[PDB]
Every structure is written in structure tokens, then in C-alpha cells.
Amino acid sequence: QIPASEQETLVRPKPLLLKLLKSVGAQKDTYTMKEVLFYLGQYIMTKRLYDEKQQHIVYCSNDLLGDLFGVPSFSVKEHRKIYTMIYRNLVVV
Numbered sequence: 258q259i260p261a262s263e264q265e266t267l268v269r270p271k272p273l274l275l276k277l278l279k280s281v282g283a284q285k286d287t288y289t290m291k292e293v294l295f296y297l298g299q300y301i302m303t304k305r306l307y308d309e310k311q312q313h314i315v316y317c318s319n320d321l322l323g324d325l326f327g328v329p330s331f332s333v334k335e336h337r338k339i340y341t342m343i344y345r346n347l348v349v350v
């Protein structure tokens with residue numbers, strides 16, 4: 258399980274991630290990983306990108322999120338994978 262310290266990491270989103278974050282209310286130059294995770298969470302929730310019957314699976318093949326992550330789908334239970342996909346879309350300060 259990922260160290261709690263990682264969510265305190267200061268990050269600067271790349272342009273596509275920044276675009277997505279701004280669509281869920283982001284106003285900042287710099288975020289914590291915790292903030293990024295929560296904004297992306299709200300994006301998934303608001304748009305209902307998760308399967309109605311298999312609710313842990315996020316489907317994003319027809320969404321900007323899929324461009325960002327380079328996958329058609331992923332499980333929210335894949336925590337290391339989620340960190341990796343997010344980190345590839347930002348610059349650690």
C-alpha cells in the first residue's frame with residue numbers, strides 16, 4: 258500500500274491534465290497529489306465514467322481521461338497504476 262506521504266507531493270499538471278482539472282473547478286498553478294486525486298475522482302463521479310454494474314471499473318476510451326491515461330479502462334483498486342498514470346501527466350515541483 259502506497260505511503261501516505263505521496264499524496265502531499267507538490268505537482269504542476271501538464272496541459273491536458275490541467276484542462277481536465279479546470280473542468281472540475283481547479284484554479285491553481287500547483288496542487289498536492291491529494292487535490293489531483295480528488296478532482297479526478299469528482300470528474301469520474303460527475304460524468305459517471307464507472308460501470309453501473311461493476312462500479313470499480315472506470316471506462317474512459319471515449320473520454321479525455323483515456324487520452325490522459327493511455328488506457329480504455331482501469332480499476333479504482335489498481336492504486337499503484339493510478340499513481341503512475343497521474344504522475345506521467347504532471348511535473349513534480
Ligand SMILES: COc1cc2c(cc1OC(C)C)[C@H](c1ccc(Cl)cc1)N(c1ccc(N(C)C[C@H]3CC[C@H](N4CCN(C)C(=O)C4)CC3)cc1)C(=O)C2
Nearest residue numbers: 259264291294295297298299301307312313333336339340
Ligand atoms: C487521496 O487519495 C485518493 C482519493 C480518491 C481516490 C483514490 C485515492 O487514493 C488511491 C489512489 C490510493 C479515488 C480515485 C480513483 C481513480 C482516479 Cl484517476 C482518481 C481518484 N476516488 C474514487 C473515484 C472513483 C470511484 N469509483 C468510480 C467507485 C465507486 C464505488 C461505489 C459507487 N456507489 C455504490 C452505490 N451508491 C449508492 C453509492 O453511493 C456509491 C460509486 C463509484 C471510487 C473512488 C476518489 O473519489 C478520490
Ligand SMILES: [Cl-]
Nearest residue numbers: 319320321322
Ligand atoms: Cl471528453
